[PDB]
Amino acid sequence: EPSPYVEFDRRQWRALRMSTPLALTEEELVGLRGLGEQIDLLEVEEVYLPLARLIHLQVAARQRLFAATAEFLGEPQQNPDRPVPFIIGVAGSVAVGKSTTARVLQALLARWDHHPRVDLVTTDGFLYPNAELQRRNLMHRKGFPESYNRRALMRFVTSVKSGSDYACAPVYSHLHYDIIPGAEQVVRHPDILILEGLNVLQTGPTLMVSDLFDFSLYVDARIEDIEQWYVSRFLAMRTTAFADPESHFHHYAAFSDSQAVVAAREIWRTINRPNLVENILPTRPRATLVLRKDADHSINRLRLRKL
Amino acid sequence: EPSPYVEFDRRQWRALRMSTPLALTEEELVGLRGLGEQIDLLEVEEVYLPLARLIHLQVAARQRLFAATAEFLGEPQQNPDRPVPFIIGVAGSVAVGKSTTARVLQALLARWDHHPRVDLVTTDGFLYPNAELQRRNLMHRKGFPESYNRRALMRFVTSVKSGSDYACAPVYSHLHYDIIPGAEQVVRHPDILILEGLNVLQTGPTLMVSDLFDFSLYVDARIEDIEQWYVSRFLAMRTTAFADPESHFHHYAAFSDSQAVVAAREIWRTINRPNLVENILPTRPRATLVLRKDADHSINRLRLRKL
């Protein structure tokens, strides 16, 4: 049975590091690591460094492709001070670590030669504001496809990849649980743009952001493990984020372990699980590379699309 | 407003012919032309020849891309006596001419230098047999996504593109309105494979045939024009295909003009229109190139995906 995919284990995958330099300290790793995430410098050596290699190889080859269409159109030859930006999508469930994965990947690629401008944008900024979610009856569907201004997101990525000088994305506060009035993230003709979100890999009756990806990543794990990571991280946040009297979720700080397990389980069951099953997981088959995590957060298997 | 697309008119498009040779007679054109289709050598010069150019340019550049992943995997370098087959998808409504478009495109590419093996497979062969359609209650949904063994189709294209020596597709009889017992089409490591069908561009919760396309075409026209072409061609077939006493639809030969208009309109309304609206048209936004036809069958506008 021939297949579009090839599976790896860490053994096999790490061999494809060749001689890529590790350009990242313990202190820097820390700054990118989210609460509960186990990633260390080893994993970055054996997992993220082959990945960065693969991407370097594909960036050049992906340029050929746009140049051919340029040659065809008889267009001015492509300004080397600004090629067509490489778009990378990073998807997966709440609590699976995908955000850390994208930050880390950003760090690795910013540290190539001649030092490529590598931007990272999360789809948080494209959530509808709370007022607008209330209007659409979606205050309990935050993270579902329809809780996003998908049109604005598509405008953004399309703006960037088409070679615009600058594009703006709004900005989300996790503290306040809402979009920040007046705040903008500004992205200026990067060489690489990484876009990270739950549903970035979605497809539809219209051209979407996944149709612009030159490369995509989906961070995966058994569903019960993710529930565990999610519940655990919720308990943990009682003394970090919820501890802030400003936090929209301050009332959670005073929960008992079991009150907090109960609350976390109910949010998992009513929001995050259904989203993962109905929307996120169906996008996995299209990802260039799946990073499979064992119950301890450790990436031990990988699935690559060779077709 | 930046855009993934660039629109052309025939004027603009035909200029991109450069100096591509026309390698096709009137007699050969005829043999590829379906009943009711207006395509002539002019249209092939001004429309199909830029298209063949664009494709030649992209075939080489698409090879870079697979070689990079090969370089990454540290794989044996790619046998030049057999590169990774270029897959082209051709979609659109019943009666819009897409089949002619694909035959013609096959002819043009088979007539390049060193003479590339260019296969053409229609998704007809992958219809479930009638007995099996009856079982699924789908004898009046022929052409809808679910009337196809999509799994077998995916196995086929995956087989070919992965570099298999041979792959087999079943074969459909239009005469008998059913799959032909024992019949196989055999495709042997072509350089280019064209896959033509109503829904080939569909997407889904699984990796599908559209995810293997390196290039896609969608032949388009105003919906009322296609109904007209369909109705007209149905009347016409009273003295061609239906005229055969063997034809599954022989009883249609004896219809009056207006009886035949009535029958054709009802099939349009109950089958072909709903399929076009619900399934085929939503795939248009993803096509590399849309070929837009005026009420006379003439391709006068084109939409290209530059992103």
Ligand SMILES: Nc1nc2c(ncn2[C@@H]2O[C@H](COP(=O)(O)OP(=O)(O)CP(=O)(O)O)[C@@H](O)[C@H]2O)c(=O)[nH]1
């Ligand atoms: N204030 C607050 N922040 C949260 C909450 N849940 C998640 N976050 C933060 O918002 C972002 C969303 O995390 P999540 O959606 O689970 O994805 P993830 O990829 O697992 C996040 P990472 O890899 O950094 O741990 C993360 O940066 C996380 O630290 C919450 O309930 N309250």
Ligand SMILES: Nc1nc2c(ncn2[C@@H]2O[C@H](COP(=O)(O)OP(=O)(O)CP(=O)(O)O)[C@@H](O)[C@H]2O)c(=O)[nH]1
């Ligand atoms: N025997 C028979 N053949 C049909 C009938 N309708 C279409 N065909 C033939 O089967 C194929 C399906 O045509 P259709 O699905 O309309 O697509 P198309 O791209 O417009 C076909 P072309 O470009 O060759 O005219 C074509 O080769 C056509 O000649 C029919 O009712 N009976």
